[PDB]
Each structure stands twice: as structure tokens, then as C-alpha cells.
Write the C-alpha cells for this entry.
Amino acid sequence: EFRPGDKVVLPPYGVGVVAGIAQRSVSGVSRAYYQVDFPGSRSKAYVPVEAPHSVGLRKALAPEEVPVILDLLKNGRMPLPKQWAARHRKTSEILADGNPYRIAQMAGQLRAWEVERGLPDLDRQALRRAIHLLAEEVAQSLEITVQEAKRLFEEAWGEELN
Amino acid sequence: QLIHKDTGLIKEDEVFLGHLPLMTEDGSFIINGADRVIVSQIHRSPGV
Amino acid sequence: DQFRVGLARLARGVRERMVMGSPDTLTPAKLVNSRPLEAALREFFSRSQ
């Protein structure tokens, strides 16, 4: 369940607070619907209360989960196919998937490769867009704007952030 | 609003379209920084 | 008239983006377009008699 003021995630919307629940008229009878808003978008969202766990509606990590993610961010890697197709495809799916542990785990190998040989014009967006959801997630949990939030990664990276 | 056919999941998210020229006081728009005018047209009315 | 007939050219630019890529993660923020409409209006306001 999600109360009015719960801090949640709605892929790929990064983070947003739930405003409440309402009966939206969809087709036939109106099932209950959760409401996820994003002030840094001015968008809007309606999430069915039936199976919230099927839309990948997770919740912002707690301040306790910062170090673990950082540790899997600095070191943790993972092999990927050589031809750009499968590799970038996988990375993309992982991105839209909305999984901070997987996005960070990915960011690790992507980082190891970026300063070695160097990152293709594709995997670059697959890195940037990856660090984006992270930097904002940190801003949701620790309530510190993308300035400070991005200032976090600098430690477990070795370099600053864009 | 972009809605899934099966998932029953709703996604609204307002977007952008473009720029639509506005008419002045006198009744003539400004295209490419020039003062132009839209003259009326005439053709037979629809029907049998 | 030019707005609607120009908007249908956008509707087709809608039906080609959704039918591919990632049908799960999509928003109209990626499904719409400017030019099919923008150019449609810019055309009328200049070239028409």
C-alpha cells in the first residue's frame, strides 16, 4: 500500500511522491487508482491499485541503502556481449527497468571500460542516463538536491560528476 | 494520455506541439516577420 | 482544416513509434512530434493563395 505522501518510484519517471487515491473511470467500472506526481516534470501518473508490484512501482531506497549501492557502484561489474547491439540493448532495458542495484551494478563495468579503451557513442548515453536515475534517487532518499546527490558518487568513482 | 491496452496502466504526461501564429488587432497575422493577411475563400456548400 | 489534416500526419507518426522499441516504458513525451504539425501550419500561412 501507499499512503498520501509516500515517496515512491515509477519507471522511468525516477522518483515522485504519491498524492493519494481516486476512482478513475476507465472503460467500465472505475477501480481504485494510486496517484504519482513529479514536481520536476509537471507530469502526472495513474497507477492501478490492483497489482502495483507489476508496474515496477517500487519505493525510494532508505538512507541505509546508500553505502551498499555505492560499493556495488565502485567495484561491481558484469560481462556483456561484444557486438554493440545486444550490449546496448541489455543496458537500455536495465535502464528503463528501474532497478537501482542493477543500474549501479551496470555503472560499475561501464565505468571500468570508459576509462580504459573508451566508451562508444552509444554506451555513453547508456552510462549518462544510468547515472541520472541514481543521482536523482539519492536526492529523493537523502533529500539532497542533484548538486549534493551527485557530489556523493564522487567518492566511490574517483572523479566528479556532470 | 498514453494508456496500455492490456496492462490497464494509465500514463498521462502533457507534451508540446509547436508554435501557432496569433492574429493581431486589425486582423492580419505576421509570418516570417512580414505583415500578411488571410483572404476569404468561396466554394459551393456541401450537400445534395 | 490544415491543422487537422496536418495533425493526422502526426497521428501516423504516433502509430509508428509505439509499435516498436519498448512498448512497456513509453510516454506521449516520446510518442508525439512537432514538424508534422508545425510545418503543416507554416506551410499554409505562407504558400496558400
Q: What stands out?
A: The radius of gyration of chain C is 13 Å. Chain C touches chain B at residues 26-29, 31-32, 34, 37-38, 41, 45-46 (CB under 8 Å). The helical segments of chain C are 2-15, 28-31, 35-47.
